[PDB]
Amino acid sequence: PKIHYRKDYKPSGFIINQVTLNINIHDQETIVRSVLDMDISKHNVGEDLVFDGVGLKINEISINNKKLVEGEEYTYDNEFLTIFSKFVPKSKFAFSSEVIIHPETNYALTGLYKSKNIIVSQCEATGFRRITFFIDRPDMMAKYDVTVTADKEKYPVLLSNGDKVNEFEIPGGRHGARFNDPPLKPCYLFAVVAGDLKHLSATYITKYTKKKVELYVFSEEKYVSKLQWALECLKKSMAFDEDYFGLEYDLSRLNLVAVSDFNVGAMENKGLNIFNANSLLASKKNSIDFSYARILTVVGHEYFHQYTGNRVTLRDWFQLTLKEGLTVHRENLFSEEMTKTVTTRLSHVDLLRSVQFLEDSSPLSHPIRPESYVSMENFYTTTVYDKGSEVMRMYLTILGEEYYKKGFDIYIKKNDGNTATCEDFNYAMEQAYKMKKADNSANLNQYLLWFSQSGTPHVSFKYNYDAEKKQYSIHVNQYTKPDENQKEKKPLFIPISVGLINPENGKEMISQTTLELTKESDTFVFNNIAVKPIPSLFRGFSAPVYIEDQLTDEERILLLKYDSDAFVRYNSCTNIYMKQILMNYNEFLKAKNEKLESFQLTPVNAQFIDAIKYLLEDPHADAGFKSYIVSLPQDRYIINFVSNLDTDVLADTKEYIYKQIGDKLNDVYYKMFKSLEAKADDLTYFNDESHVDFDQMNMRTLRNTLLSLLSKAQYPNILNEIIEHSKSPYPSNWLTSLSVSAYFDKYFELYDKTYKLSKDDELLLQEWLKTVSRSDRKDIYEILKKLENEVLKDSKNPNDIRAVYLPFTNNLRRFHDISGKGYKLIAEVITKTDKFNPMVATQLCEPFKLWNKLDTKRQELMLNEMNTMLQEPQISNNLKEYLLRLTNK
Ligand SMILES: CC(C)(C)OC(=O)N[C@H](C(=O)NO)c1ccc(-c2ccccc2)cc1
Ligand SMILES: [Mg+2]
Ligand SMILES: [Mg+2]
Ligand SMILES: [Zn+2]
């Protein structure tokens, strides 16, 4: 099993200048003819010519139109084509090949494959080698001339990168289209699409050069009515890149295409972006609210790649976070500006501190620029993407908007049209840093540690106030736990956005301030501080760290009520909850361990409950924010703070705390559920697909959150509200009515009712599957078996498989059943999926990521299932490598 090392990067001994492809799609096979115009590079040392080529059936290969013969002149082992150097020309030459591939049975969804009745490619990272021979690495830049042919009736729409320069009929009911794409690109940005596609289109005029850009969004005919929001999102994306970054689209056309079978959300192939249908298609009748932010995010993300990834590309795959962290950051700026809701930023933090922090404290922990890899398909992690985006965001926090924009433009101007590394970006930011600090001595050398050092830093605080001196001190300490990547962790450049709140009137006591912590510890002193403040720390979540604020619950309540920063308010709430959770957890644990006949639990702080009521009853407070304060922290966040976590004890702990708060606030919750109805469920724009109101969707989130709390509590006659809710036109509402009805005898009636509403829309049915999967049912294992037999069956669609099983794995009480039956079940699904789609099989391993954080019995149960999966004779490279790293084998 070959390990690739970052330190080992060396340029190729060859050059590929021109790619000319003929892709001939037939019923039982696809024939790919390729001519590569090549040359010898300055780094060449007379080596064999070795192409990547995986699963290809060779008809013939040639050099300069002379047929090569197997054994004497070349070898092929289904992975590498090796042409012996004595037969490799010493100057410019042409290599040609004809291979047969089989998209119809390509269920791994990499290379060229069939999704329903659409032929589509997915080449990032190393998929182009599954289509034809190539030196499949992103620093091999070439020009592409691509012809596609196919049955005209089955495949009337043909697409590839660049301009369509010819269309022609072919005897036998076939037809062809030729696409020429002169600008250099890496092969992972190649794409082809063939199918009976329908479209919506628009013309966009660029802000400065006034170029007309044709925008096309495509789907199968059945779902063409779900394309409108995507087209709007694309127009929004283009405008934002223009307005914030001064960047215009450079091509005459941009196509977006939805397909049903896709391993991830979408892919940024140049001028031809390809999407999981669940991240492009929506309608108000057939989609839950979450779809609208999802499409905005994913469309935005692939568009922003056109600069950060496509025009400025990667030298090698170790630089992945340079395009992904940066593009996620750009998409976050975009979405925050489009939604105008504080919950956008909060949702990203919530995801980072649960999922990414868990990864970073797991055996899988890696820095955002790893030192090695075995599987590129396993490389696309929340660390690289989401911690990457926070590292990219910190530059903006450090520099401020004006100088950040200056640095970013330096990066784009200097590297446009070329490959780049993480150092190039840091260099550009450093120039802006020098400008900002007004001295050419300033540098960001220490900042590079964010790329190389793994683990989550812990930042802790102590305070001092001298009333006579009016002098306030913040003592700050950072620490990163040693792990397998660094025995000794170095201090990072940590920017700490801070405010000081006057506790008597809630007002700001200082101007905007970002502390630059660059040592293991520092003391920051403030003069003329008239009264002892409450510090507002890491505003906007200004660094990806564990925050230990060392504040009392009284101080945290004051911030929650009166601070100006949404994240600090939310975090203060989070911290109050965590203190309660840890306390009650240990009390339940003791009772379990000692087999106590009686014991005491510490109640929830009454002033905290009062503060929640205060905020809920404030008509000017934000609905989305309100939904966060009545929800306990995610389980995957909590587990970062507890050793040997007993999931049953945690379930009892959460139950107690929710019941404590509900016993006081349920009447408030109910009053709000009712008073919010009018605005939340307003139908005025239900048939306008371009009208999207993120505040109104947040009101529905709040209502559905409250309905869940009230239902669990068996609030008097709440079943009436549930039934009425099931009749709402909004799928977010009537799917919610299904999951909250879990606690009542009407569950299977709503099950059938909502299934009937869902079954005739592919994506809606998948949302229904998720709702059933995450239902809080005691008979959930029987229900999953029912889903398997009646709906899922032997579908190889990753959306179907993920919908049925992943939400269930978040059922704390049931998935972690002490019998191990839940672990057994998902391991069986992983092994089954691994036979046809290793990438998705590895995704389905996600619940096992915390295995060594659980109680010893559950660790053993999980470890056993992973060892069982590892012993399967037919285990994929993906799954084997992943489980070996996860189990520390
Ligand atoms: C959600 C968000 C938008 C952040 O990301 C995604 O939807 N897609 C990613 C991505 O970065 N798109 O730009 C992405 C991730 C992985 C692949 C891949 C890698 C190997 C093989 C096959 C596929 C391909 C794409
Ligand atoms: Mg093959
Ligand atoms: Mg299907
Ligand atoms: Zn991306």
PDB file of C-alpha atoms in Angstrom, residues 109-303:
ATOM      1  CA  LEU A 109     -19.353   7.009  -8.944  1.00  0.00           C
ATOM      2  CA  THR A 110     -15.784   7.972  -9.784  1.00  0.00           C
ATOM      3  CA  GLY A 111     -14.419   8.275 -13.324  1.00  0.00           C
ATOM      4  CA  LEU A 112     -17.163   7.984 -15.947  1.00  0.00           C
ATOM      5  CA  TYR A 113     -20.453   6.551 -14.715  1.00  0.00           C
ATOM      6  CA  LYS A 114     -24.182   6.328 -15.276  1.00  0.00           C
ATOM      7  CA  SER A 115     -26.546   8.034 -12.850  1.00  0.00           C
ATOM      8  CA  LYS A 116     -30.055   6.880 -13.747  1.00  0.00           C
ATOM      9  CA  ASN A 117     -30.145   7.826 -17.445  1.00  0.00           C
ATOM     10  CA  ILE A 118     -27.373  10.422 -17.331  1.00  0.00           C
ATOM     11  CA  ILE A 119     -23.737   9.712 -18.160  1.00  0.00           C
ATOM     12  CA  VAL A 120     -21.542  11.857 -15.989  1.00  0.00           C
ATOM     13  CA  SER A 121     -17.916  12.086 -14.883  1.00  0.00           C
ATOM     14  CA  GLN A 122     -16.274  12.740 -11.521  1.00  0.00           C
ATOM     15  CA  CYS A 123     -12.519  13.220 -11.819  1.00  0.00           C
ATOM     16  CA  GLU A 124     -11.309  14.908  -8.617  1.00  0.00           C
ATOM     17  CA  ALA A 125      -9.035  13.838  -7.205  1.00  0.00           C
ATOM     18  CA  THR A 126      -7.625  10.874  -9.124  1.00  0.00           C
ATOM     19  CA  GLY A 127     -10.613   9.838 -11.241  1.00  0.00           C
ATOM     20  CA  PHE A 128      -9.445  10.946 -14.694  1.00  0.00           C
ATOM     21  CA  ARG A 129      -7.191   7.876 -14.751  1.00  0.00           C
ATOM     22  CA  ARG A 130     -10.371   5.755 -14.741  1.00  0.00           C
ATOM     23  CA  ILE A 131     -11.359   7.266 -18.107  1.00  0.00           C
ATOM     24  CA  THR A 132      -8.057   7.233 -19.977  1.00  0.00           C
ATOM     25  CA  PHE A 133      -4.289   7.089 -19.453  1.00  0.00           C
ATOM     26  CA  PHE A 134      -2.746  10.232 -17.989  1.00  0.00           C
ATOM     27  CA  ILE A 135      -0.105  11.569 -15.661  1.00  0.00           C
ATOM     28  CA  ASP A 136      -2.962  12.110 -13.232  1.00  0.00           C
ATOM     29  CA  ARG A 137      -1.726  14.907 -10.943  1.00  0.00           C
ATOM     30  CA  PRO A 138      -2.831  18.523 -10.728  1.00  0.00           C
ATOM     31  CA  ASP A 139       0.482  20.103 -11.780  1.00  0.00           C
ATOM     32  CA  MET A 140       0.148  18.483 -15.240  1.00  0.00           C
ATOM     33  CA  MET A 141      -1.601  21.368 -17.044  1.00  0.00           C
ATOM     34  CA  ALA A 142      -2.863  20.885 -20.602  1.00  0.00           C
ATOM     35  CA  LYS A 143      -5.220  22.102 -23.317  1.00  0.00           C
ATOM     36  CA  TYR A 144      -8.310  19.968 -24.014  1.00  0.00           C
ATOM     37  CA  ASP A 145     -10.141  19.220 -27.255  1.00  0.00           C
ATOM     38  CA  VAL A 146     -13.051  16.866 -26.520  1.00  0.00           C
ATOM     39  CA  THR A 147     -15.531  15.134 -28.813  1.00  0.00           C
ATOM     40  CA  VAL A 148     -18.436  13.143 -27.393  1.00  0.00           C
ATOM     41  CA  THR A 149     -20.745  10.877 -29.402  1.00  0.00           C
ATOM     42  CA  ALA A 150     -23.887   9.003 -28.380  1.00  0.00           C
ATOM     43  CA  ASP A 151     -27.340   7.777 -29.324  1.00  0.00           C
ATOM     44  CA  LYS A 152     -29.259  10.975 -30.050  1.00  0.00           C
ATOM     45  CA  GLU A 153     -32.593   9.834 -28.610  1.00  0.00           C
ATOM     46  CA  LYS A 154     -31.114   8.688 -25.266  1.00  0.00           C
ATOM     47  CA  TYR A 155     -28.524  11.462 -25.017  1.00  0.00           C
ATOM     48  CA  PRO A 156     -29.624  14.650 -26.867  1.00  0.00           C
ATOM     49  CA  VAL A 157     -27.696  16.980 -24.560  1.00  0.00           C
ATOM     50  CA  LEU A 158     -23.922  16.654 -24.673  1.00  0.00           C
ATOM     51  CA  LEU A 159     -21.627  18.798 -22.535  1.00  0.00           C
ATOM     52  CA  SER A 160     -17.940  19.212 -21.725  1.00  0.00           C
ATOM     53  CA  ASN A 161     -15.559  22.072 -20.765  1.00  0.00           C
ATOM     54  CA  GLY A 162     -14.955  25.044 -23.037  1.00  0.00           C
ATOM     55  CA  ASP A 163     -16.773  26.165 -26.162  1.00  0.00           C
ATOM     56  CA  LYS A 164     -18.962  23.871 -28.233  1.00  0.00           C
ATOM     57  CA  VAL A 165     -17.400  24.347 -31.637  1.00  0.00           C
ATOM     58  CA  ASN A 166     -19.231  21.669 -33.612  1.00  0.00           C
ATOM     59  CA  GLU A 167     -22.356  19.519 -33.607  1.00  0.00           C
ATOM     60  CA  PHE A 168     -22.913  16.741 -36.118  1.00  0.00           C
ATOM     61  CA  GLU A 169     -25.125  13.806 -37.029  1.00  0.00           C
ATOM     62  CA  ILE A 170     -23.780  10.248 -37.191  1.00  0.00           C
ATOM     63  CA  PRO A 171     -25.163   7.240 -39.124  1.00  0.00           C
ATOM     64  CA  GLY A 172     -27.150   4.839 -36.950  1.00  0.00           C
ATOM     65  CA  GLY A 173     -29.109   7.448 -35.020  1.00  0.00           C
ATOM     66  CA  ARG A 174     -26.052   8.871 -33.254  1.00  0.00           C
ATOM     67  CA  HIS A 175     -24.732  12.405 -32.924  1.00  0.00           C
ATOM     68  CA  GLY A 176     -21.638  14.231 -31.749  1.00  0.00           C
ATOM     69  CA  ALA A 177     -20.490  17.482 -30.200  1.00  0.00           C
ATOM     70  CA  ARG A 178     -16.958  18.860 -30.109  1.00  0.00           C
ATOM     71  CA  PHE A 179     -15.771  21.087 -27.264  1.00  0.00           C
ATOM     72  CA  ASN A 180     -12.527  23.072 -27.359  1.00  0.00           C
ATOM     73  CA  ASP A 181     -11.097  24.449 -24.125  1.00  0.00           C
ATOM     74  CA  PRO A 182      -7.869  26.363 -24.872  1.00  0.00           C
ATOM     75  CA  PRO A 183      -6.907  27.578 -21.354  1.00  0.00           C
ATOM     76  CA  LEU A 184      -4.616  25.162 -19.494  1.00  0.00           C
ATOM     77  CA  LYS A 185      -6.234  23.078 -16.730  1.00  0.00           C
ATOM     78  CA  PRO A 186      -5.420  20.054 -14.529  1.00  0.00           C
ATOM     79  CA  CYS A 187      -7.180  16.860 -15.503  1.00  0.00           C
ATOM     80  CA  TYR A 188      -9.254  16.741 -12.296  1.00  0.00           C
ATOM     81  CA  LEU A 189     -11.285  19.664 -13.726  1.00  0.00           C
ATOM     82  CA  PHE A 190     -12.233  17.780 -16.894  1.00  0.00           C
ATOM     83  CA  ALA A 191     -15.901  16.822 -17.140  1.00  0.00           C
ATOM     84  CA  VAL A 192     -18.382  15.335 -19.570  1.00  0.00           C
ATOM     85  CA  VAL A 193     -22.170  14.964 -19.312  1.00  0.00           C
ATOM     86  CA  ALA A 194     -24.588  13.222 -21.687  1.00  0.00           C
ATOM     87  CA  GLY A 195     -28.338  12.875 -21.160  1.00  0.00           C
ATOM     88  CA  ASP A 196     -31.946  13.889 -21.799  1.00  0.00           C
ATOM     89  CA  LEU A 197     -31.476  17.075 -19.801  1.00  0.00           C
ATOM     90  CA  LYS A 198     -33.955  19.942 -19.503  1.00  0.00           C
ATOM     91  CA  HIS A 199     -32.894  23.418 -18.410  1.00  0.00           C
ATOM     92  CA  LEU A 200     -33.580  26.901 -17.153  1.00  0.00           C
ATOM     93  CA  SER A 201     -31.285  29.659 -18.390  1.00  0.00           C
ATOM     94  CA  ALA A 202     -30.465  33.345 -17.955  1.00  0.00           C
ATOM     95  CA  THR A 203     -27.945  35.927 -19.139  1.00  0.00           C
ATOM     96  CA  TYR A 204     -25.668  37.646 -16.605  1.00  0.00           C
ATOM     97  CA  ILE A 205     -23.780  40.844 -17.476  1.00  0.00           C
ATOM     98  CA  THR A 206     -20.502  41.253 -15.599  1.00  0.00           C
ATOM     99  CA  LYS A 207     -20.011  44.358 -13.479  1.00  0.00           C
ATOM    100  CA  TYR A 208     -16.916  45.838 -15.105  1.00  0.00           C
ATOM    101  CA  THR A 209     -16.105  44.332 -18.495  1.00  0.00           C
ATOM    102  CA  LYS A 210     -19.838  44.065 -19.257  1.00  0.00           C
ATOM    103  CA  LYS A 211     -19.383  40.562 -20.694  1.00  0.00           C
ATOM    104  CA  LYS A 212     -22.531  38.528 -21.347  1.00  0.00           C
ATOM    105  CA  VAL A 213     -22.412  35.192 -19.535  1.00  0.00           C
ATOM    106  CA  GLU A 214     -24.910  32.438 -20.386  1.00  0.00           C
ATOM    107  CA  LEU A 215     -26.122  30.616 -17.258  1.00  0.00           C
ATOM    108  CA  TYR A 216     -27.675  27.152 -17.657  1.00  0.00           C
ATOM    109  CA  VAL A 217     -29.044  24.882 -14.930  1.00  0.00           C
ATOM    110  CA  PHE A 218     -29.931  21.303 -15.948  1.00  0.00           C
ATOM    111  CA  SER A 219     -31.881  18.356 -14.564  1.00  0.00           C
ATOM    112  CA  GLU A 220     -33.850  15.351 -15.722  1.00  0.00           C
ATOM    113  CA  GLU A 221     -37.233  16.357 -17.159  1.00  0.00           C
ATOM    114  CA  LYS A 222     -39.191  15.173 -14.101  1.00  0.00           C
ATOM    115  CA  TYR A 223     -37.583  17.762 -11.850  1.00  0.00           C
ATOM    116  CA  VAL A 224     -37.025  20.728 -14.170  1.00  0.00           C
ATOM    117  CA  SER A 225     -39.493  22.742 -12.029  1.00  0.00           C
ATOM    118  CA  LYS A 226     -37.027  22.540  -9.109  1.00  0.00           C
ATOM    119  CA  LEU A 227     -34.259  24.526 -10.848  1.00  0.00           C
ATOM    120  CA  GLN A 228     -35.251  28.143 -10.103  1.00  0.00           C
ATOM    121  CA  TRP A 229     -33.606  28.732  -6.727  1.00  0.00           C
ATOM    122  CA  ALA A 230     -30.293  27.324  -8.006  1.00  0.00           C
ATOM    123  CA  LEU A 231     -30.247  29.811 -10.880  1.00  0.00           C
ATOM    124  CA  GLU A 232     -30.979  32.639  -8.422  1.00  0.00           C
ATOM    125  CA  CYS A 233     -28.175  31.421  -6.156  1.00  0.00           C
ATOM    126  CA  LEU A 234     -25.723  31.422  -9.051  1.00  0.00           C
ATOM    127  CA  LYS A 235     -26.601  35.007  -9.940  1.00  0.00           C
ATOM    128  CA  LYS A 236     -26.156  35.923  -6.281  1.00  0.00           C
ATOM    129  CA  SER A 237     -22.743  34.223  -6.202  1.00  0.00           C
ATOM    130  CA  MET A 238     -21.473  36.050  -9.260  1.00  0.00           C
ATOM    131  CA  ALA A 239     -22.611  39.398  -7.861  1.00  0.00           C
ATOM    132  CA  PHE A 240     -20.901  38.770  -4.514  1.00  0.00           C
ATOM    133  CA  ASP A 241     -17.533  37.809  -6.042  1.00  0.00           C
ATOM    134  CA  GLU A 242     -17.830  41.032  -8.042  1.00  0.00           C
ATOM    135  CA  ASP A 243     -18.885  43.200  -5.089  1.00  0.00           C
ATOM    136  CA  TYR A 244     -16.655  41.865  -2.312  1.00  0.00           C
ATOM    137  CA  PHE A 245     -13.584  40.682  -4.200  1.00  0.00           C
ATOM    138  CA  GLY A 246     -13.843  42.615  -7.467  1.00  0.00           C
ATOM    139  CA  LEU A 247     -13.734  39.323  -9.400  1.00  0.00           C
ATOM    140  CA  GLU A 248     -15.690  38.650 -12.617  1.00  0.00           C
ATOM    141  CA  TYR A 249     -16.436  35.375 -14.391  1.00  0.00           C
ATOM    142  CA  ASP A 250     -14.138  34.943 -17.399  1.00  0.00           C
ATOM    143  CA  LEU A 251     -15.983  32.418 -19.586  1.00  0.00           C
ATOM    144  CA  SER A 252     -18.979  32.942 -21.872  1.00  0.00           C
ATOM    145  CA  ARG A 253     -21.064  30.168 -20.278  1.00  0.00           C
ATOM    146  CA  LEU A 254     -21.529  28.346 -16.990  1.00  0.00           C
ATOM    147  CA  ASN A 255     -23.465  25.087 -16.735  1.00  0.00           C
ATOM    148  CA  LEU A 256     -24.792  23.528 -13.518  1.00  0.00           C
ATOM    149  CA  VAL A 257     -26.047  19.941 -13.785  1.00  0.00           C
ATOM    150  CA  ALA A 258     -27.949  17.895 -11.192  1.00  0.00           C
ATOM    151  CA  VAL A 259     -27.562  14.106 -11.035  1.00  0.00           C
ATOM    152  CA  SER A 260     -29.159  11.635  -8.658  1.00  0.00           C
ATOM    153  CA  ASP A 261     -26.072   9.604  -7.749  1.00  0.00           C
ATOM    154  CA  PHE A 262     -23.155  11.595  -6.326  1.00  0.00           C
ATOM    155  CA  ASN A 263     -20.647  10.906  -3.540  1.00  0.00           C
ATOM    156  CA  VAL A 264     -20.543  14.445  -2.190  1.00  0.00           C
ATOM    157  CA  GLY A 265     -22.419  17.736  -2.599  1.00  0.00           C
ATOM    158  CA  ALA A 266     -20.994  19.003  -5.898  1.00  0.00           C
ATOM    159  CA  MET A 267     -17.884  19.441  -8.027  1.00  0.00           C
ATOM    160  CA  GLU A 268     -16.359  22.566  -9.602  1.00  0.00           C
ATOM    161  CA  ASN A 269     -15.413  21.322 -13.114  1.00  0.00           C
ATOM    162  CA  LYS A 270     -14.589  24.400 -15.215  1.00  0.00           C
ATOM    163  CA  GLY A 271     -17.721  25.836 -16.805  1.00  0.00           C
ATOM    164  CA  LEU A 272     -19.539  22.564 -16.032  1.00  0.00           C
ATOM    165  CA  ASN A 273     -20.324  22.253 -12.329  1.00  0.00           C
ATOM    166  CA  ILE A 274     -21.922  18.928 -11.412  1.00  0.00           C
ATOM    167  CA  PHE A 275     -24.190  18.542  -8.365  1.00  0.00           C
ATOM    168  CA  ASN A 276     -25.769  15.985  -6.145  1.00  0.00           C
ATOM    169  CA  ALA A 277     -29.431  16.671  -6.924  1.00  0.00           C
ATOM    170  CA  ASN A 278     -30.025  17.251  -3.189  1.00  0.00           C
ATOM    171  CA  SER A 279     -27.709  20.266  -3.363  1.00  0.00           C
ATOM    172  CA  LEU A 280     -29.161  21.874  -6.517  1.00  0.00           C
ATOM    173  CA  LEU A 281     -32.901  21.085  -6.727  1.00  0.00           C
ATOM    174  CA  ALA A 282     -35.692  22.493  -4.558  1.00  0.00           C
ATOM    175  CA  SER A 283     -39.311  23.584  -4.613  1.00  0.00           C
ATOM    176  CA  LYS A 284     -41.397  24.862  -1.728  1.00  0.00           C
ATOM    177  CA  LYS A 285     -43.854  21.983  -2.105  1.00  0.00           C
ATOM    178  CA  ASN A 286     -41.234  19.248  -2.260  1.00  0.00           C
ATOM    179  CA  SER A 287     -38.292  20.403  -0.130  1.00  0.00           C
ATOM    180  CA  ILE A 288     -37.628  21.061   3.526  1.00  0.00           C
ATOM    181  CA  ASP A 289     -36.361  24.511   4.510  1.00  0.00           C
ATOM    182  CA  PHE A 290     -32.749  23.310   4.960  1.00  0.00           C
ATOM    183  CA  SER A 291     -32.490  22.736   1.203  1.00  0.00           C
ATOM    184  CA  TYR A 292     -32.492  26.461   0.494  1.00  0.00           C
ATOM    185  CA  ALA A 293     -29.384  27.317   2.531  1.00  0.00           C
ATOM    186  CA  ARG A 294     -27.788  24.087   1.291  1.00  0.00           C
ATOM    187  CA  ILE A 295     -28.220  25.042  -2.396  1.00  0.00           C
ATOM    188  CA  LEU A 296     -27.081  28.604  -1.678  1.00  0.00           C
ATOM    189  CA  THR A 297     -23.963  27.202   0.009  1.00  0.00           C
ATOM    190  CA  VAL A 298     -23.084  24.591  -2.563  1.00  0.00           C
ATOM    191  CA  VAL A 299     -23.802  26.678  -5.647  1.00  0.00           C
ATOM    192  CA  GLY A 300     -21.818  29.515  -4.071  1.00  0.00           C
ATOM    193  CA  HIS A 301     -18.965  27.187  -3.145  1.00  0.00           C
ATOM    194  CA  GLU A 302     -18.503  25.715  -6.631  1.00  0.00           C
ATOM    195  CA  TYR A 303     -18.736  29.191  -8.191  1.00  0.00           C
TER     196      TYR A 303
END
